[PDB]
Coordinates of C-alpha atoms and ligand atoms in Angstrom, one line a residue:
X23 CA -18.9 38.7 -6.5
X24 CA -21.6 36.1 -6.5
X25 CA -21.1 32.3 -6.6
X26 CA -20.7 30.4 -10.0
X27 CA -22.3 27.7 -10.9
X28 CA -23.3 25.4 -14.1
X29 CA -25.8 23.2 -15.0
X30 CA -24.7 19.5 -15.3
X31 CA -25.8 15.7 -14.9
X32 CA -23.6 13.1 -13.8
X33 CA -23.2 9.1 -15.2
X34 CA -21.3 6.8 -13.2
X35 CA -18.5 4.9 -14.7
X36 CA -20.8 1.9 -15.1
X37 CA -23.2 4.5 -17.5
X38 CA -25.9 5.1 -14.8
X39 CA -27.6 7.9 -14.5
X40 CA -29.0 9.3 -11.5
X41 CA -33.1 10.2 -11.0
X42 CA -34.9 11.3 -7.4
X43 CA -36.9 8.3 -6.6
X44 CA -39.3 9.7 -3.6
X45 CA -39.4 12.2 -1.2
X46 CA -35.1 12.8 -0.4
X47 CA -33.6 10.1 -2.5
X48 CA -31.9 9.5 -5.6
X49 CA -30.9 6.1 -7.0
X50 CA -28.8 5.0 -10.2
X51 CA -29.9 3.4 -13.2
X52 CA -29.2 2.7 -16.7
X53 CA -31.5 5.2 -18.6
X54 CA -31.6 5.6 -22.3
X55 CA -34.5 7.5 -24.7
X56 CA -37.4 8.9 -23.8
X57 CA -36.9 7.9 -19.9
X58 CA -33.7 10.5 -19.7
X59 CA -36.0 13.6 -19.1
X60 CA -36.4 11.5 -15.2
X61 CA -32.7 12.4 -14.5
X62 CA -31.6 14.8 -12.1
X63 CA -30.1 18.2 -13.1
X64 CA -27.3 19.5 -11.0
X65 CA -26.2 22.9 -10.4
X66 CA -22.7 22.5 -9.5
X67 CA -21.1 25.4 -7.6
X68 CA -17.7 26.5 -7.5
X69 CA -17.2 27.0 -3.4
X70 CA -14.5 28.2 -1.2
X71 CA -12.1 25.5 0.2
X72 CA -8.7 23.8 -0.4
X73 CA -8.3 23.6 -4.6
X74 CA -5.2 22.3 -6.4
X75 CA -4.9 21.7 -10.0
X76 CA -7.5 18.5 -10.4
X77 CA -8.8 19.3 -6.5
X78 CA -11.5 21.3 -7.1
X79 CA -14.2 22.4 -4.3
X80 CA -17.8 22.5 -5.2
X81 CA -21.3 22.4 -3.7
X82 CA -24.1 19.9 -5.7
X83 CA -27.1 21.8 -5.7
X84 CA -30.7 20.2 -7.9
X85 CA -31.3 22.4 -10.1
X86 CA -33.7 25.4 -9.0
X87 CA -34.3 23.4 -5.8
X88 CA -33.5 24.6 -2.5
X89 CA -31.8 20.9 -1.7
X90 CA -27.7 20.2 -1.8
X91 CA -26.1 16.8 -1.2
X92 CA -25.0 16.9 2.0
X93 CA -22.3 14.8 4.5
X94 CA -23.4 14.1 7.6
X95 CA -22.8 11.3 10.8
X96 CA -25.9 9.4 10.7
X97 CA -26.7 6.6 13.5
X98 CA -22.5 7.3 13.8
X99 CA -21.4 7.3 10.5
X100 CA -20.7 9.2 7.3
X101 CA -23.8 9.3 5.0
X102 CA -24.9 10.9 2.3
X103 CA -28.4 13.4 2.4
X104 CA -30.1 15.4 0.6
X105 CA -30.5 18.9 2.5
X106 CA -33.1 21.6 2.0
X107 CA -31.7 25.1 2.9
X108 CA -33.2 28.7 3.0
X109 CA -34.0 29.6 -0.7
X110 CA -32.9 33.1 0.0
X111 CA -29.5 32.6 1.1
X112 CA -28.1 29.8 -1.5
X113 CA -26.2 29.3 -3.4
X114 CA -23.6 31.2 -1.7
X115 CA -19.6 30.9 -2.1
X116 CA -19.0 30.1 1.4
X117 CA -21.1 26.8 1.5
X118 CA -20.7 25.2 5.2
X119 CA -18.5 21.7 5.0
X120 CA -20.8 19.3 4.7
X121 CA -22.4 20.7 1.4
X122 CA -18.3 20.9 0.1
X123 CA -17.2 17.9 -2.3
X124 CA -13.6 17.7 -3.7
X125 CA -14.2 16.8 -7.4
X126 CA -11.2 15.3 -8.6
X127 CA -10.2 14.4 -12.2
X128 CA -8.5 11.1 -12.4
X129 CA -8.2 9.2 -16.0
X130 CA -10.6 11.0 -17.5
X131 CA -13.1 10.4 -14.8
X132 CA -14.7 12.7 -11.8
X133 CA -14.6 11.2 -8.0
X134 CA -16.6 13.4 -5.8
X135 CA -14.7 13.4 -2.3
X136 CA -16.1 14.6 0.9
X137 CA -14.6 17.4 2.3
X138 CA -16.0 16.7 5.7
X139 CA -15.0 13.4 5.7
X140 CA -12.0 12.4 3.6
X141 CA -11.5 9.3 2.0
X142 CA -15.5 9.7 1.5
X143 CA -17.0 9.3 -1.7
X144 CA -20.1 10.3 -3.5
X145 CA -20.8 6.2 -4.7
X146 CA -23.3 3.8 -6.8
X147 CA -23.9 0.3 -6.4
X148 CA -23.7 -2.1 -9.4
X149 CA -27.2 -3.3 -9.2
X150 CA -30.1 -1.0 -10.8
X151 CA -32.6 1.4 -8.8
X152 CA -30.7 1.3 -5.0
X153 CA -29.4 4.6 -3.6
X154 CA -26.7 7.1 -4.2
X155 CA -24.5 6.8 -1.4
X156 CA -21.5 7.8 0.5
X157 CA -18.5 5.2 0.7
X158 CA -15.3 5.0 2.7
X159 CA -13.6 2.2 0.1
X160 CA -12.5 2.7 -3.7
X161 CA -12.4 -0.4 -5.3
X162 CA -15.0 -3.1 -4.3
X163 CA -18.4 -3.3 -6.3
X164 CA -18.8 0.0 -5.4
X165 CA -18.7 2.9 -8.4
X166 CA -17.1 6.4 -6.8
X167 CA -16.2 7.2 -10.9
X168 CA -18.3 9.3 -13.1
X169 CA -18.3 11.7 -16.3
X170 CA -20.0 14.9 -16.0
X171 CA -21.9 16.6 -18.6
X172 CA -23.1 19.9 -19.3
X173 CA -26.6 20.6 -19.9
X174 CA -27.9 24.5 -21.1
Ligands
S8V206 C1 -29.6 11.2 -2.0 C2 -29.1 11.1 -0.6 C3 -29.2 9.6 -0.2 C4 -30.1 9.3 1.0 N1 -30.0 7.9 1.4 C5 -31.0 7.5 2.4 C6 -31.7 6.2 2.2 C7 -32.5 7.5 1.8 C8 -29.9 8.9 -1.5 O1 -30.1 10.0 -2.4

């Protein structure tokens, strides 16, 4: 059957929200009022891949954009992009590896692991407006937490 999806935004633990800043880029900040329009709306597929009970495979797709988070080496290591694809042919429920995140529900909280690259994780910094990026440490001024929320 087709691919399912939902409509969402995600906070990091630290309350940021996330907004594309330029071209390919989105960065984290605290938001509140009128300013909350700015943020981005995800459409979060459910994908094929390895799933146990709080292991659960997805794609993150902008919302009626042709552009997925992506894992990738860069200059030889694991980074975060933002990846356009052909409009006709996403989503899809086999999504190729790099566009697959393991979101995991820990405490309450969502972590966003790689499936390309485990021990990866979708990450924030604590300081306002720098990029979303993708970290290989848990624990270290670096936010890989966040609460997900869904949007009609
Ligand atoms: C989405 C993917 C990431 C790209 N980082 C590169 C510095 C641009 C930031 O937002």
């Amino acid at each position: 059957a087709p691919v399912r999806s939902l409509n969402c935004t995600l906070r990091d633990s630290q309350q940021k929200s996330l907004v594309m800043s330029g071209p390919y880029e989105l960065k984290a900040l605290h938001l509140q009022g009128q300013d909350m329009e700015q943020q981005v709306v995800f459409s979060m597929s459910f994908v094929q891949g390895e799933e146990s009970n709080d292991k659960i495979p997805v794609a993150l797709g902008l919302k009626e954009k042709n552009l997925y988070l992506s894992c990738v080496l860069k200059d030889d290591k694991p980074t975060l992009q933002l990846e356009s694809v052909d409009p006709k042919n996403y989503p899809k429920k086999k999504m190729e590896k790099r566009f697959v995140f393991n979101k995991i529900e820990i405490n309450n909280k969502l972590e966003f692991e790689s499936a390309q690259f485990p021990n990866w994780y979708i990450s924030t910094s604590q300081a306002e407006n720098m990029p979303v990026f993708l970290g290989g440490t848990k624990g270290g001024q670096d936010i890989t937490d966040f609460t997900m929320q869904f949007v009609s």
